Amino acid sequence: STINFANREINFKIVYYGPGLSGKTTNLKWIYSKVPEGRKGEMVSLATEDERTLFFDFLPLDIGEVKGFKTRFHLYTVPGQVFYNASRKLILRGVDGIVFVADSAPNRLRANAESMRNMRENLAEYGLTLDDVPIVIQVNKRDLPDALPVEMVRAVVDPEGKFPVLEAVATEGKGVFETLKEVSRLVLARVA
Numbered sequence: 001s002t003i004n005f006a007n008r009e010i011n012f013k014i015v016y017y018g019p020g021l022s023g024k025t026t027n028l029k030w031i032y033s034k035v036p037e038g039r040k041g042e043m044v045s046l047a048t049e050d051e052r053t054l055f056f057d058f059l060p061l062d063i064g065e066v067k068g069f070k071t072r073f074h075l076y077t078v079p080g081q082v083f084y085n086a087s088r089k090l091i092l093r094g095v096d097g098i099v100f101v102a103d104s105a106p107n108r109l110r111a112n113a114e115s116m117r118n119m120r121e122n123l124a125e126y127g128l129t130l131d132d133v134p135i136v137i138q139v140n141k142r143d144l145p146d147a148l149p150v151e152m153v154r155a156v157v158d159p160e161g162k163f164p165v166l167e168a169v170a171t172e173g174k175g176v177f178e179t180l181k182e183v184s185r186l187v188l189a190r191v192a
């Protein structure tokens with residue numbers, strides 16, 4: 001949401017949210033691997049025993065100058081199993097858009113629903129509803145042999161089909177850029 005006169009940049013924050021081990025890191029790292037060195041900052045991981053945050057910023061090469069001003073995307077996620085809520089609540093501060101990385105595993109179906117309820121709860125602390133922020137659903141791990149039907153996964157996190165849904169196999173980069181383009185489209189629309 002930030003404007004930075006000094007370096008001539010507007011800054012958008014994109015949060016990858018979802019149950020633990022759904023593929024959030026993997027999305028971030030695939031993306032970070034295809035950005036040229038000169039257009040990205042460092043990928044940074046801050047951790048305690050119980051908590052983690054991982055983030056980087058980059059200048060997408062797909063985006064026009066809004067009157068001399070470049071666009072910088074900052075991608076944030078709370079990777080790993082989650083022990084406390086505090087890093088997931090904080091991750092959402094000043095969020096512009098969110099990718100929800102759902103796990104296609106039968107035994108993570110409940111974890112999907114749980115993380116979505118939690119995102120909704122954390123958003124509510126900032127006075128925001130699920131209608132107030134662009135949210136895209138990525139159904140990741142479509143390669144698993146017992147991958148649930150996409151419609152089933154979608155049904156527990158988005159029963160009225162309010163959000164765009166994309167399939168992914170983040171370990172192979174599949175769906176990864178298309179998911180980032182989708183949230184990008186919605187965030188940049190709101191801007192202009």
Ligand SMILES: Nc1nc2c(ncn2[C@@H]2O[C@H](COP(=O)(O)OP(=O)(O)O)[C@@H](O)[C@H]2O)c(=O)[nH]1
Nearest residue numbers: 020021022023024025026079080141169170171
């Ligand atoms: N089979 C499969 N494994 C995946 C996929 N995406 C991520 N993983 C694996 O899932 C585990 C958790 O992924 P990670 O990105 O670290 O999770 P997160 O950051 O906690 O959401 C890792 O072992 C990944 O290799 C996928 O599309 N298919």
Ligand SMILES: [Mg+2]
Nearest residue numbers: 020078079080
């Ligand atoms: Mg996590």
Ligand SMILES: [Mg+2]
Nearest residue numbers: 041042056057
């Ligand atoms: Mg950076």
Ligand SMILES: [Mg+2]
Nearest residue numbers: 103104105109
């Ligand atoms: Mg599932």
Ligand SMILES: [Mg+2]
Nearest residue numbers: 123124128129
């Ligand atoms: Mg809410």
